[PDB]
Amino acid sequence: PGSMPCCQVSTNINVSDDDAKKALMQIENAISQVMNKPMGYIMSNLDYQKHMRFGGSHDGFCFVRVTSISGISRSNNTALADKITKILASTIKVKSDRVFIEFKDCSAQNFAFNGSLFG
Amino acid sequence: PGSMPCCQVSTNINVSDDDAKKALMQIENAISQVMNKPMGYIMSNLDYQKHMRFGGSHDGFCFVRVTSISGISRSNNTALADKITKILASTIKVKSDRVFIEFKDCSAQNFAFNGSLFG
Amino acid sequence: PGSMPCCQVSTNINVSDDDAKKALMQIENAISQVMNKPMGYIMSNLDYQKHMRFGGSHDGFCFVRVTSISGISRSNNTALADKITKILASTIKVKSDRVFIEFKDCSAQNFAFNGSLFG
Ligand SMILES: [Cl-]
C-alpha cells in the first residue's frame, strides 16, 4: 500500500451520530483528494472529550491529528489544514479559530498493517 | 502566535467533572508560567480510560502528553514534569510513581490554527 | 528504569470489560518478551471509539500505538507487529487486515516518571 493516512478529530462538542459520520466522510473525501489515496486505505475517527478546553474556555474546540507515512508536506498540509477546518466549521459548528491541526510523518519501519511492516 | 501548547492527561481514575476542571486549570497555569504563553493559546484535556493499566495493575495511573512547537527544551521539560506530577497527585490523588509524562516537539510546518500553518 | 513501554489500542469494537483485560494482558506479555522489560514498567490501554471507521466502513478495526524510549528497532517492531495483530484477532475477533500498528521512538529527555526526566 505504501501509505495509509489517518485522521482523528477530538472535540468537546457533543456531536450527534449523524453529524459525526457526515464530518468524517467529508474529511475522508478531502484526504483521498489531497493524498491521492483510495478510500480503502483511509482511517478516520471522531472522539468526544467532554472535559477538553482551549483558551481557558469550554467553548467548542477541535484538535485534529493527521498521520501518514507519505504525503506529509507543506503543500498537502496547507490544503488539508484549509479543508478540514472548513468541514468541521460547517458540520459541527466549531469556530475556525477554535481548530488545531497536527500533521505527523511516520517512517515505514514504524508502521504496520496486517501484521507486517511497510518496509 | 508562534507556539500553542497542548496537554492531554489520560487516566484510569474516574475523575469528577469539577476535579477534572481543577486539574486542567492548575496544569494550564503551570504551562503558562513555564512556556510564558497567555491562556488564550493553551489547550488542555482530561481523558478517562477505564481499561488503562500500569505495572500489571488497575490502580490510579496518569499518562500525560505535552505538545508544543517551541518550549520543548530540557529546562522546561524538567520544570513541567515536576509541576504537573505534583498537581495531579494533589487534585486527583494519583501516586507520584504512577504518572508518566511525554514531551513532543512539533514542527511549525506540521501545525495549523484557523486553517493556516504556523510556519 | 531506562525505558517504560506503552501500548494504546483504539477500536470501534465495543469490547466487554473482560475481553479488554484479556487482550491487554496478552499484549503486555508480548511487550515484556520482545522489549525484555518487567511488567512493572509496562503501560497498556484499550479505548473504545464508537465513531472510528476504516476503508469507509464501520466494521471492526483497531489502531495500535506502541511508544517506548528504547526497543523501537526493526527487529522488535516486526515481532510485536505480528504478535499484537494475532492477539487482537484472537481475543476481540478483529480481522488482521483491519489492524494498524504505529511505533514511536521517544527521547529520554522527553519522558518523565515520578516527576523526573529519564535522560
Ligand atoms: Cl460545547
Chart the SSEs and their pairings.
The structure is a homotrimer of 119-residue chains.
Chain A: E1 6-11, H1 17-35, E2 43-48, E3 53-54, E4 62-68, H2 74-91, E5 99-105, E6 111-113, E7 116-117
Parallel strand pairs in A: 1-2, 4-5
Antiparallel strand pairs in A: 1-4, 6-7
The structure holds chloride ion.
The site of chloride ion has 3 residues of chain A, from loops.
What report would you give on this structure?
- The structure is a homotrimer of 119-residue chains.
- The first copy, chain A, has 119 residues and is an alpha/beta fold.
- Chain A is 31% helix and 28% strand.
- Chain A has a single domain, classed as 2-Layer Sandwich (Macrophage Migration Inhibitory Factor), CATH 3.30.429.10.
- In chain A, helix 1 links the parallel strand 1 (6-11) and strand 2 (43-48).
- The radius of gyration of chain A is 15 Å and the shape is elongated.
- In chain A, 47% of the residues are buried.
- Strand 5 of chain A pairs antiparallel with strand 6 (111-113) of chain B.
- The structure holds chloride ion.
- Chloride ion (CL) binds next to loops of chain A.
- It is classed as cytokine.
